[PDB]
Design a protein around this ligand. Structure first.
Ligand SMILES: CNC(=O)c1cc(C(=O)NC2CC2)cn(Cc2ccccc2)c1=O
Length: 112
């Protein structure tokens, strides 16, 4: 988990993004995109830096993130990858937009 006050807020957000409350739209972001399994044979040609919430959780648990900004960059990279790869009318993009709304509104409540 987070040690710094701001990293504890980040860890709180991460726990919320992984909670049953948001599972209906969070689930595509729980684990790395399995490009082979999903038939997305161009995924790793288009997405140079895959990211997902299990990777963010591992990095938080390993004290990889030194500040809130570094944590937020990985969460936003995950959404950006979704918006880059997927047609904007795909269900996964609607789910990304909803989960990013949850993220951005709570990230904005960061303690100073
Ligand atoms: C981060 N996830 C992805 O980018 C992703 C891409 C595609 C996908 O098939 N994308 C192609 C480009 C349309 C499929 N799923 C599963 C899914 C998700 C939501 C509804 C149905 C299926 C994903 O999670």
């Amino acid at each position: 988990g987070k040690l710094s006050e701001q990293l504890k807020h980040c860890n709180g957000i991460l726990k919320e993004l992984l909670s049953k409350k948001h599972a209906a739209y969070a689930w595509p972001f729980y684990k790395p995109v399995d490009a082979s399994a999903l038939g997305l044979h161009d995924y790793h040609d288009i997405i140079k830096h895959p990211m997902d919430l299990s990777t963010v959780k591992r990095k938080m648990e390993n004290r990889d993130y030194r500040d809130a900004q570094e944590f937020a960059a990985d969460v936003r990279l995950m959404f950006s990858n979704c918006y880059k790869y997927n047609p904007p009318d795909h269900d996964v993009v609607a789910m990304a937009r909803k989960l990013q709304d949850v993220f951005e509104f709570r990230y904005a409540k960061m303690p100073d």
